[PDB]
Amino acid sequence: NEKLVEKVLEATRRIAREEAVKYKDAFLRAYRARDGAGLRRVITGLFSKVDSRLYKEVLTDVPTIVALQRRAGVDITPEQAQEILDNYDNEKHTAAVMDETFALLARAAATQASYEELLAAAPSGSVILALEVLRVLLEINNLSWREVLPLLALAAASG
């Protein structure tokens, strides 16, 4: 499981880096305006695009889905993983994952949690994916988590 999830994360990080460059200027504009709703829209758009590609290219079978969920401490059966694959809906999934992710980010902002701590707190495999995507977007903009967390918490109350 450890080995397959690192393959998942390697592909997630690569795809996120490819896509994030297209969104980096819009991300910075929302950051500089301290526009919580706008920042959330840009992160949501990047994640939707990455996640759509993941469900075509990376998250395509039972062992991959099972391994991703195990990393977040969720044990699922083969049939439960196949249900995830068969019911995937990009729009519905992106929205639900962004809700959980922004709630986690609001808590991290209130406690000044580190990235490693907030990642360890991810309640699902999809939240892990969302946090990895966000980390790539921050890094290519040379933005620190301390700089952006307050605005992310405001986005948790917006949308």
SS (H, E, C) 71-131: HCCCCCCHHHHHHHHHCCCHHHHHHHHHHHHHHHHHHHHHHCCCHHHHHHCCCCHHHHHHH
Domain boundary assignment for the chain: 2-156
Rounded to whole angstroms, how far apart are CA atoms 61 and 10?
A: 17
Burial of 127 from C-beta contacts in 10 A (0-12 / 13-18 / 19+):
buried
Tell me, in Å, the resolution of the deposited structure. Answer: 1.2
Instruction: Name every residue whose Cβ is closer than 8 Å to that of residue 9 and which is 6 or more positions away in sequence.
Output: 128, 132
Please check whether residue 72 is in contact with residue 128, taking contact to mean a CB–CB distance below 8 angstroms.
yes
Rounded to whole angstroms, how far apart are CA atoms 31 and 41?
A: 12
